[PDB]
Amino acid sequence: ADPEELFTKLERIGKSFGEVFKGIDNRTQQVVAIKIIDLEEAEDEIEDIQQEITVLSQCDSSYVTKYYGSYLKGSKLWIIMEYLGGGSALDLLRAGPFDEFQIATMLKEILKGLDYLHSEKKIHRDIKAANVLLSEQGDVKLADFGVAGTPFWMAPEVIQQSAYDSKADIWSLGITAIELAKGEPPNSDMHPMRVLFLIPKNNPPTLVGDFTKSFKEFIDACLNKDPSFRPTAKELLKHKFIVKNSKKTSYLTELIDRFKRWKAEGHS
Ligand SMILES: CNc1ncc2cc(-c3ccc(-c4cccc(C)n4)cc3Cl)c(=O)n(C[C@H]3OC[C@H](N)CO3)c2n1
Ligand SMILES: [Cl-]
């Protein structure tokens, strides 16, 4: 039961608490994502780690990053998850802007993710472009669930400590939609401790500029300050913006290919 025999690390992917690799299961040759947390250098995060594992282990959805299991060796905890070779939506943004077709196609898939979670009575809690991973063939999945830092995507009712529900995810989706349109969320320059009070105090963000009215109205519905006035995920799946602008999956692989051309051409 030795994960250094079971698995081979192929290349580093990034750095939550720990470091993550693209890996391979030597028994099946399945490409996996492997996270390694040193449990001797993260005492106060430990309660959150088993919380996140519990939740992902209860998900069995094609729109949620799969969890395959966990291994311990010494003080190292190995967490094995499905591997998504397209990168995050935030990664795809580094090589240029998305158009409304691509944005709508992607929000449609995130919305299916959220509709799954909310119908199983779970809340993602940290919807943002960096937490939306794509397979290389363009599937769109959710990762990096929130704990029950950076407040830019937080709904005002979660900031005020007011016990919240799944409508918090709809607000965050609204902010994610602005992030996919402008590259970054509202108030990106403010210090986060200032943003923690500007979000409940201010009127909701709107999308300003040369965008269709339907797109603008999609975001205005998500960003109602009163949560009971935000639409559910299933309602948003029939919103005019999604219905009129969402396209086949190859609209996303074109973004994946663009990002790959970008990296291979030496840009960073
Ligand atoms: C680019 N392909 C790609 N494919 C797949 C995964 C998968 C995970 C993953 C997620 C969550 C966890 C996990 C599970 C339970 C508890 C705890 C504390 N962490 C374990 C992994 Cl192994 C990942 O970290 N990344 C990278 C990440 O970087 C940060 C970003 N916000 C999201 O993606 C992945 N990347
Ligand atoms: Cl891209």
DSSP element (H, E) containing 83: none
Is 97 close to ligand 1, i.e. is its CB under 6 Å away?
A: no
Handedness of CA 168, 174, 175, 179 (dihedral sign): positive
Q: Residue 138 in contact with residue 89, Cβ under 8 Å?
A: no
Give this entry's resolution in angstroms. 2.1
CA distance 161 to 14: 31
Catalytic residues: 126
CA 223, distance to chain mean position in Å, is 18
Residue 147 CA, ligand 2 centroid: distance in Å: 29
Is 13 close to ligand 1, i.e. is its CB under 6 Å away?
A: yes
Q: Does the annotation flag 157 for ligand binding? A: no
SS3 of residue 123 by DSSP: coil
Among the bound ligands, the one closest to the CA of 23: 1
CA distance 70 to 33: 12
E-assigned strands of 39-175? 67-73, 76-82, 87-88, 132-134, 140-142
DSSP letters spanning 189-253: TS-HHHHHHHHHHSPPP---SS--HHHHHHHHHHT-SSGGGSPPHHHHHTSHHHHHH---THHHH
Q: Which two tokens stand for residue 173?
A: 């989706």
DSSP 8-state secondary structure symbol assigned to residue 179: H
Q: Residue 33 in contact with residue 23, Cβ under 8 Å?
A: yes
Is 65 close to ligand 1, i.e. is its CB under 6 Å away?
A: yes
Among the bound ligands, the one closest to the CA of 98: 2
Q: Which two tokens stand for residue 101?
A: 């077709």
Method used to solve the structure: X-ray
CA distance 199 to 225: 9
